[PDB]
Every structure is written in C-alpha cells, then in structure tokens.
Amino acid sequence: MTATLRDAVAADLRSITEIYRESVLNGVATYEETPPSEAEMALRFSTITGNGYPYVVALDERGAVIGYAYASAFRNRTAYRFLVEDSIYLSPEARGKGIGKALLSELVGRCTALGFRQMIAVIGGAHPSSIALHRALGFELQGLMKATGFKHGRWLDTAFMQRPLGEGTATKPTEGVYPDTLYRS
Amino acid sequence: MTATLRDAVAADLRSITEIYRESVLNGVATYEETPPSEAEMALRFSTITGNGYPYVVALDERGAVIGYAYASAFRNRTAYRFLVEDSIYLSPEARGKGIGKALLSELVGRCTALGFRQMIAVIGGAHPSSIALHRALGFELQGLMKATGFKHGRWLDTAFMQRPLGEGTATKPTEGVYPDTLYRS
Ligand SMILES: CC(=O)SCCNC(=O)CCNC(=O)[C@H](O)C(C)(C)COP(=O)(O)OP(=O)(O)OC[C@H]1O[C@@H](n2cnc3c(N)ncnc32)[C@H](O)[C@@H]1OP(=O)(O)O
C-alpha cells in the first residue's frame, strides 16, 4: 500500500522514542548505546524542527505511528548549511513494505523544495538494506570508513553516501533566504 | 629543524584563538564563518581536554605559540569511542617548516598510546596540501564529498581520510579502560 506520511507533532513522541529505542538496543543503524528518554527525544525534535528541517512520520491503517524520518545538519558549521543528512527509522513490523523508500523520497523532495543542495547518508554498519534503499533513490556511495564503530561486540564499518538536491552545485545559492539563513552569527 | 611541541595550557588560548581566527577568515580548512571568541575557544579546549584527548601547541624559538593541534571525537556517540578526528592549524609563519608533520605525528602517537584504534581527517576544501600532509603520515583517501561546503562564494569539496591506530581492527578493545570508558551512560 502507498505509505501514509505526515509531519511529526509532539503527540508522536512516545512512538518515536520507542522506535528509536528498539534501534538503539538491537541494531547498528545508530551508534548510540543508551536509549534516549522521551524528554531528550523532545529536545532533539524541537531542535531539528526549529531549524526548519522536515520531520515526518509514517502511519499504519489505524493512524498509528510506525516509522519516522528527518533531515538535519551533517555538522552545524556555517559552510555546511546547504548540506543535510537523512535519518530513517521503522518499527520492525513496518519494515519490508516500501515505507523506507516513501520516507526517503519525502525527505529528498522536501529538502529540494526547501533549497538544500546536497544530502548525505551516514549508514551505520554499512547495512546492506540501507545502502540499497539509498542507491534506489539516486545516492552514490562515496566512501567506507572501516572499523569506525564498535557495538554488539564487533567492529563496524560506516558507509557514506551522497545525493545532489535540486540544482546541486550548478548554481550559487539564493542569498538571504532559507537555508542560506542557517548557522549565521 | 625538529619542531618544538608541548601540551597546550590555558595561557595559550589567546594565541590559539588568533591562529584560528586567521584560518576562519582566510582559509577553508574550517567551515566556521565567524571567528570564535577566546572565551568560546577556551570552552572548547576545556571540553576536548576534559574528555582525555591530546591538545598540543608548536612553538617558535622564543617559545611563542605558532600552531596547534588536537584530537577529538568524530561524533560523540558510544560506538565511535575508538575513533578520533585530527584538527591542525598553523599560523602563516609556521607553514613550510615540517611543523604540520610534527603536530600530526604527535596526535597519531598520542592517540596510539591512549588506545584509540582509527583516526579520521575531514579536510575542508579538499586542499591538496592538507591531503598530502595526511598521506605522508599514512592516511589514505576514503572519499570526496563534493560541493558540501559553501564559503567565500564557492562550492567546496570535503575530503575524508583515515589511518588505523595501533592494533586497529585486529583485536577487540580492552573493556573498562580508556577510551572504552568514553561516552558510556
Ligand atoms: C541513513 C539512514 O537512516 S539508513 C536507515 C537506518 N535505520 C535503520 O536501520 C532502522 C531499521 N530499519 C529500517 O527502519 C528499515 O528497514 C530501513 C529504513 C533500513 C529500510 O526501509 P524498509 O522500508 O524496510 O525497506 P526494505 O524492505 O528494503 O528493507 C529490508 C530490511 O527490512 C527487514 N524486514 C522486512 N520485513 C520485516 C519484518 N516484518 N520485521 C522485521 N524486519 C523486517 C529485512 O529483513 C531487511 O533487513 P535486513 O537486510 O537486515 O535483513
């Protein structure tokens, strides 16, 4: 079924927190070890959305949140302001249903519309399903940082992939409008 | 001539701040746009050194600070705790004298002794001179993230390089001794 997506709101916090918790504990998509609290997750949500970045949820047929995705800074230094990084997390039972691709497509589309110019994915563990998802939406593998993570008793590689957004490098950004207005002080 | 290095102390912050300011304003090694104040640099120094990472200066023949370098996290998430990233800043007068090599040698050696297992360099602008410095110290180019920075009116590439440290990926780290103790909670 075509996925059901909408922007995240505060009321989605429990589901977001629990989905992320499961990934923290069981996976290598995230290199965090201790699940954040809901209050920490709330700070992160407020920070991401306060910077104008998209933060979306996927819903099941009853309207319940079953996955989420957001864009944020790669690094919040000024010169990186036209670059975003994607993060995508689905609850286990929502996997294998095309929802990851819907979420990534949504982040790509939103960030293009908003005026960003490049997107990077930092793929924990170089997880093959995650690489495949990104490749299908036009990301290219840029490097493999070997044995950079250590989790679940093993060394992990970290893959870096990139996709241009919109005009990419072909034009200069529009001065004085979002996202050129990010990280200026 | 052999470089004169020592660990940084609080009394070096004024000089460190001035060196970094020149880099912020005139270079693309750093993607920061506004020079930090000495107070801000001092907080950064406190944080880096509070995490046990090495922070060093290079001196001229009279003892004045003419460059500095430190290791710190690539990202401060648990699974990255055995990975460090190097940062090196030379005043204009310190360039072309083997001082970058000495600083990087010190970071590599220190982080090897401390028990880190990989070092990454994230090279702003992909400047060939910085790439070559790192290559000379055994780093290999891992990828080039194109048009990821925008500074001084230009799209900038960002190069990623990596060197193993010590045992690298060949052994599991010893539990409960630094740097296994970083970022745990
Ligand atoms: C930069 C990034 O954010 S990369 C994504 C990082 N996030 C995660 O890894 C979180 C956990 N995984 C997920 O959220 C998703 O599976 C994604 C985002 C990686 C991919 O989106 P999906 O819509 O599942 O796409 P797709 O069907 O192609 O995924 C196949 C993966 O889901 C697993 N899967 C499929 N159906 C199920 C199910 N019912 N229960 C549990 N797992 C399932 C598959 O086994 C496979 O994972 P594997 O390669 O480890 O075996």
* Rounded distance between C-alpha atoms, residue A19 and residue B118, angstroms: 30
Resolution (A): 1.1
Tally of residues, chain B: 185
Two structure tokens written together for A93: 């039972």
Helical segments of chain A, H only: 13-26, 38-50, 99-114, 128-136
How many Cβ atoms sit within 10 Å of the Cβ of residue B73? 17
* Interacting residues of B29 by C-beta distance below 8 A, sequence separation 6+: B23, B89, B123, B124, B125, B127, B130
How many Cβ pairs closer than 8 A exist between chain A and B?
Answer: 111
Residues B8, B142: Cα–Cα separation, whole Å: 30
| Residues sharing a CB contact under 8 Å with residue B179, sequence separation 6 or more, in sequence order | B52, B81, B82, B114, B115, B116, B173
Tokens of B65: 């600070």
Q: How far apart are the first and last CA of chain A?
A: 46
User: Helices B99-114 and B128-136: crossing angle, nearest 10°?
Assistant: 50
Place of tokens 């990010």: A182
Beta pairing, strands B118-124 & B83-90: parallel
Q: According to the entry, how was the structure determined?
A: X-ray
Q: How far apart are CA A33 and CA A26, in angstroms?
A: 10
- Using a CB-CB cut-off of 8 Å, the residues of chain A touching B124 are 79
User: Residue B6: phi, psi to the nearest 5?
Assistant: -155, 170
Tell me, what DSSP letter sits at residue A159? E
Binding residues of B, as ranges, are 88, 90, 96, 100, 127, 129
Q: Are A81 and A117 in contact (CB under 8 A)?
A: no
Tell me if A96 is assigned to a ligand binding site: yes
Residue showing tokens 């920075």: B149
Contact A108, A59 (CB under 8 A): no
The number of residues in chain A equals 185
Kindly give the residue spans of alpha helices, DSSP state H, lying in chain B.
Answer: 13-26, 38-50, 99-114, 128-136
- A24, A56, A129: which to mutate for ligand 1, most atoms within 8 A of CB? A129
> Ligand 1, closest atom to CA A67?
14
DSSP B78: G
**Cα B153 to middle of ligand 1, angstroms:** 40
Q: Calculate the CA dihedral of residues A5, A9, A11, A17 and round it to 10 degrees.
A: 80
CB A77 within 8 A of CB A92: no
Backbone angles phi, psi at A148, to 5 degrees: -95, -20
Report which DSSP code applies to B172: P
Residues A31 and B183: beta-carbon distance below 8 Å: no
All domains in chain A, ordered by first residue: 2-185 (3.40.630.30)
Contact between A111 and A56 under an 8 Å Cβ cutoff? The reply is no
For residues B101 and B133, is the Cβ–Cβ distance under 8 A? yes
Q: Tokens 């919040």 correspond to what residue?
A: A76
Respond yes or no on whether the N-terminal peptide bond of residue A92 is cis (omega within 30° of 0): no
Q: Please answer yes or no on whether B172 and A153 come within 8 Å at the CB atom.
A: yes
Hey, what are B124's tokens? 């702003």
C-alpha span between A51 and A70 (Å, rounded): 12
Residues of B in contact with A79 (CB under 8 A): 28, 31-33, 124, 149-151, 156
Cα separation, A167 vs A149, whole angstroms: 34
Phi, psi of B11 (to 5 degrees): -65, -10
**Residues of chain B whose C-beta is under 8 A from some C-beta in A?**
28, 30-34, 74-75, 77-83, 117-118, 120, 124, 142-151, 153, 155-156, 160, 162, 164, 168-169, 172-173, 183-185
Counting ligand 1 atoms within 8 A of each CB, the residue from A55, A95, A160 with the most, and so the one to mutate, is: A95
Tell me the β-bridge partners of A4. Answer: A59
